[PDB]
Amino acid sequence: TPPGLQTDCEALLSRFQETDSVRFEDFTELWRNMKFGTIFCGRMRNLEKNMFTKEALALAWRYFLPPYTFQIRVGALYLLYGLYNTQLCQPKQKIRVALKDWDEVLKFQQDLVNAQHFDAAYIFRKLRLDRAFHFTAMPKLLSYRM
Amino acid sequence: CVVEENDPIFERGSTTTYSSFRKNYYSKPWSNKETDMFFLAISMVGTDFSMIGQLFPHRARIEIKNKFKREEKTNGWRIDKAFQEKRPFDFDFFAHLLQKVLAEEEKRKQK
Amino acid sequence: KLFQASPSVPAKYVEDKEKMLSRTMQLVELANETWLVTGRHPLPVITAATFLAWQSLQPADRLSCSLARFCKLANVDLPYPASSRLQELLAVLLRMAEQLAWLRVLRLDKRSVVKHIGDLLQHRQSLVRSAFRDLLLPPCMLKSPKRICPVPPVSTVTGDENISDSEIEQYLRTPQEVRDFQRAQA
Amino acid sequence: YFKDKVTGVGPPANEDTREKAAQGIKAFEELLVTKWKNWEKALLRKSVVSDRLQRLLQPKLLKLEYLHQKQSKVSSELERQALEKQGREAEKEIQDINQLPEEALLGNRLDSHDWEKISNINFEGSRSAEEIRKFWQNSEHPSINKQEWSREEEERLQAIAAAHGHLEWQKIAEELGTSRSAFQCLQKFQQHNKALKRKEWTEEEDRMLTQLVQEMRVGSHIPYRRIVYYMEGRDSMQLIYRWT
Amino acid sequence: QPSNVLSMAQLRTLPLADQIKILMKNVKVMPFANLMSLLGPSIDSVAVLRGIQKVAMLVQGNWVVKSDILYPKDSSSPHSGVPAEVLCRGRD
Amino acid sequence: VSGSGGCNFPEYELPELNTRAFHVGAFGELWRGRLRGAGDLSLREPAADSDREDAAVARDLDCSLEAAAELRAVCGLDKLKEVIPENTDLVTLGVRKRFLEHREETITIDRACRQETFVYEMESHAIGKKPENSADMIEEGELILSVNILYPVIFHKHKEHKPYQTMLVLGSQKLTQLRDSIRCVSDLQIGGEFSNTPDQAPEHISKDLYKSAFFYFEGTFYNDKRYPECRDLSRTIIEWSESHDRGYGKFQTARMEDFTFNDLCIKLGFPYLYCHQGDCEHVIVITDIRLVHHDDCLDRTLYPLLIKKHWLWTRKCFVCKMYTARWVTNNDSFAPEDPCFFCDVCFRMLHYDSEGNKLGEFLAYPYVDPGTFN
């Protein structure tokens, strides 16, 4: 796991908690202040940046666990949406979703659509339209050699 | 008929067995302050093994006997020095010292 | 069970019964001529000898093992002092390896001496003669005892009839002591 | 837990393994060659000198024991004195053998030595018999000149190689008089040789290069080692220019 | 639920490399034509050839079992007790 | 016997290390029933589009006919700022500056990824790969399984077994395809002896001489019987399992020509074993499994892809050090050590005269370098 990203995510979680509501307008206002989409271009694009954005998406979707609060869930969902939509590189790195993780998202979207939050449901609609999911049995790969 | 109470154990496959011929009686070791309190108990009561064994709940009678014999064999000078000096029989302060030794050995086991 | 290649033992540990028996007989004869059968139980010495024989039969794949591993593999209860006895025998081997020129140049140790045990058994007579010309005793007495059997002072005197009488006054119990004794175990 | 799923205390073996090991299909379990160490050199030296000393001492020790037994069995005084003189001679022989410097008792490169005894006893089965044999014959031996060249023997070396036809380098090295093994000088010979490189590129080899690229090139990195393996004559240094 | 203990029923339930091996061990002289019929038409000729080249040699057009096949390295002569190596050399 | 015990909801047996066995074939139905996932065709379009978006969203999820959500679009596409990561206080900016500084210290250029282009080109081989015909197009919901094998031992001896390759296979394919797709240098080895005649051409490699190969999936040995020359390798492994009470249950045997990857009830991340050619062993790790996507290869027959072929160091000729060796010597007369290596031009001049007569006594074997498949 990248060490600097484990601190950058906790840093952006402060501004995520700073939001007052779950309407998509707060992320549009934050984009003018906290432009997280700076390193997406950089000075070089290669396997280094590929693994960088892969670990970024992985450790960002990791914060979508059930124990996290609803506002943190909305923040993480919008962050993953923006990161995927800002992938101007050659490969299209889709976020990897586990089978166990695909159970909380159901009731999450149910609560979003029942709360009349049209933007929260349209975000997931656009994510599904872009086909930005890697359905895996486990969220990460690991071996026993170490 | 019991239900899953005992586990199978392999023991004595009927081969050539080593002749142990030894019974190592477990003896609790002696500490420094424990030796000092044993010496003061001897000086206060004498050579009455029964009384010493009664006031030593952490020890045994045979252990006290072996310790007394080893002391008489090795440090007879200290044995005579302790026997010359006398001290009246104490009961309450003796129990307080027993509790202090208990706390000390508990701290030692915690270390 | 080292003689049969049963599935419970790998094939690397299997050996011939006659060769192992001859090696163990030579080693126990070496122990007998070097004062290792007198006083101590025989079975630990026999176990140490057969362990050294099994190790010397293939030090390539058996020197890394130990006596406990060998006893666990053989399904035989190992004697407690046997290892210590083993050490003593190893020491004897060293006292032999220092006499042979190639071995004393090799500068062996307690571990690398088993591989040449056969050589030590080839000319064991001259080796033990040279070792004894430089006996075996328990390590408790081999600490250079400068005072052997100290003579006690001659104090067979008994005075005239009575040396003193205060000893009786010191040995008797006082009424307070008697009351304390009666109260302690009342 | 890496070798096999069934790697317990005693691993089993299949029947087809005999067919695999019988037809000479050794693939990877024999390519585990390692370098040497200083302690290994010292162990090999000690083992070979101990083997030679034991071979020299065993007849003398046996004769001394036989003389001891005979003088313990015989009773005549003249025979006892004769046996005592013979035993004194044998003792002096053993003494002068034990006090012999460690240069003459090393033998030669191809001297008769038991390599299996050195491998299974001294080396503890860590090195094979042939692996220590070949290492003591040419790699570790005092008769091997460890000094490097002076750029004066390669000319006569290639001259003799061209006069003989590059058939047997052993006789070439022996006639050259370098006191070194043939393989030790052949490496520097082929390192100084000019036929190893190539010349101006042709057109037909470009077809093979393009085919090998279109078949096994990966991204921006080209595996030029594969080109060296397939295309003969091209080294790894200046071949990259073929795609630079 | 002799070496020819295995019957034809137990013979057919074996790989061809062992079937031709035991056939050359029991007969020691076998033509290829009749070997095709004994092995069966379902088996290709190339496999039978590559198998018989490992356990037999060609002499005057007929296949004869190899010497080491009949006499294992650990066996000896039942008539004289000499090692099997000399027997294999004599048979060759 | 049907599928072994396992639920399609994999529970971790050890936290983040492994999972319980489960029927991987039922995933393609479970995750496709609990989630539509249809649209694996890359039919994204290069007004009417807004009308379709309204008619879809205002009927599925949205309730208002006003196009108010399009602000998101104008915040996503239009508000995107050829940029330098500076003039902002972020920790990702800090680590990017650290990487750029470490680059400017020693790293001269970007052309140093001689081992990273593998996971790039071998993945680009899976994108934009149009099928051969309409009847060969992969159907939606196809299961794809990744695997990592650990064959060789030429790498680190005093370290773990990290550096080897990774492969990827399809679920609908048969196990015979995965069997024949696994490439191993041991199949290129040649038996016999070659010192008697080095000009003798290879008549039959070990691939055709021995075709026996089986797998291990939770005590299920799948044997192959396509050719009449191969043998059943599981005939002994079962006996050694039933000769003594070792605690191993009865193992079920089956064929390979009639079993698919769907019925493989196995664990992910568990170190399984694949054995072929008598004793050639391969540690196997089933890392990930996933449904088919619109970015994967559309050719079904052409998808036993080795998504990561790890680099391997070719053994150089010990004489010239400028060519790859092909012959391994034994009992040599002039080589410094027994396992020496020689190339063609060197093996010719070593012990062969002009006419090719064998000189001296020696043994030689054809050394097939592992770089052939690498």
Swiss-Prot record, chain A:
One of its GO terms (cellular component) is snRNA-activating protein complex. One of its GO terms (biological process) is snRNA transcription by RNA polymerase II. Keywords: DNA-binding, Nucleus, Phosphoprotein, Transcription, Transcription regulation. Residues 1-146 are annotated as: SNAPC3-binding. Its main location: nucleus. It comes from the Eukaryota. It is found in: Nucleus. Part of the SNAPc complex composed of 5 subunits: SNAPC1, SNAPC2, SNAPC3, SNAPC4 and SNAPC5. SNAPC1 interacts with SNAPC3, SNAPC4 and TBP. Part of the SNAPc complex required for the transcription of both RNA polymerase II and III small-nuclear RNA genes. Binds to the proximal sequence element (PSE), a non-TATA-box basal promoter element common to these 2 types of genes. Recruits TBP and BRF2 to the U6 snRNA TATA box. This is snRNA-activating protein complex subunit 1. It comes from Homo sapiens (Human). The lineage of its organism: Eukaryota, Metazoa, Chordata, Craniata, Vertebrata. The gene is SNAPC1.
From Swiss-Prot, chain C:
In response to oxidative stress, Cys-140 is reversibly oxidized to cysteine sulfenic acid. Oxidation of Cys-140 impairs formation of a ternary complex with TBP and DNA and down-regulates expression of target genes in response to oxidative stress. Sequence repeats lie at residues 1-69. Residues 144-186 are annotated as: Required for interaction with TBP and formation of a ternary complex with DNA and TBP. The keyword Nucleus applies. Residues 136-142 are annotated as: Required for the formation of a ternary complex with DNA and TBP. It comes from the Eukaryota. The modification Cysteine sulfenic acid (-SOH) is found at residue 140. GO terms for biological process: cellular response to oxidative stress; regulation of transcription by RNA polymerase III; transcription preinitiation complex assembly. It is found in: Nucleus. Changing residue 140 to D: Impairs formation of a ternary complex with DNA and TBP. GO terms for cellular component: nucleoplasm; nucleus; transcription factor TFIIIB complex; transcription preinitiation complex. General activator of RNA polymerase III transcription. Factor exclusively required for RNA polymerase III transcription of genes with promoter elements upstream of the initiation sites. Contributes to the regulation of gene expression; functions as activator in the absence of oxidative stress. Down-regulates expression of target genes in response to oxidative stress. Overexpression protects cells against apoptosis in response to oxidative stress. This is Transcription factor IIIB 50 kDa subunit. It comes from Homo sapiens. The chain holds residues 181 to 407 of 419 of the full protein.
Curated annotation (Swiss-Prot), chain D:
Changing residue 238 to R: In NEDRSO; uncertain significance. It is found in: Nucleus. Residues 102-140, 196-244 form the Myb-like domain. Residues 141-195 form the HTH myb-type domain. Residues 169-193 bind DNA. It comes from the Eukaryota. Part of the SNAPc complex composed of 5 subunits: SNAPC1, SNAPC2, SNAPC3, SNAPC4 and SNAPC5. SNAPC4 interacts with SNAPC1, SNAPC2, SNAPC5, BRF2 and TBP. Part of the SNAPc complex required for the transcription of both RNA polymerase II and III small-nuclear RNA genes. Binds to the proximal sequence element (PSE), a non-TATA-box basal promoter element common to these 2 types of genes. Recruits TBP and BRF2 to the U6 snRNA TATA box. It is linked to Neurodevelopmental disorder with motor regression, progressive spastic paraplegia, and oromotor dysfunction: An autosomal recessive disorder characterized by delayed motor development and developmental regression after the first year of life, followed by progressive spasticity with gait alterations, paraparesis, and oromotor dysfunction. Most individuals have cerebral, cerebellar, or basal ganglia volume loss. This is snRNA-activating protein complex subunit 4. It comes from Homo sapiens (Human). The gene is SNAPC4.
UniProtKB/Swiss-Prot annotation, chain F:
GO terms for biological process: snRNA transcription; snRNA transcription by RNA polymerase II; snRNA transcription by RNA polymerase III; transcription by RNA polymerase II; transcription by RNA polymerase III. Keywords: DNA-binding, Nucleus, Transcription, Transcription regulation. It comes from the Eukaryota. GO terms for molecular function: bent DNA binding; DNA binding; RNA polymerase III general transcription initiation factor activity; RNA polymerase III type 3 promoter sequence-specific DNA binding. GO terms for cellular component: nuclear body; nucleolus; nucleoplasm; nucleus; snRNA-activating protein complex. It is found in: Nucleus. The keyword Electron transport does not apply. Its main location: nucleus. InterPro entries: snRNA-activating_su3. Belongs to the SNAPC3/SRD2 family. Part of the SNAPc complex required for the transcription of both RNA polymerase II and III small-nuclear RNA genes. Binds to the proximal sequence element (PSE), a non-TATA-box basal promoter element common to these 2 types of genes. Recruits TBP and BRF2 to the U6 snRNA TATA box. Part of the SNAPc complex composed of 5 subunits: SNAPC1, SNAPC2, SNAPC3, SNAPC4 and SNAPC5. SNAPC3 interacts with SNAPC1. This is snRNA-activating protein complex subunit 3. It comes from Homo sapiens.
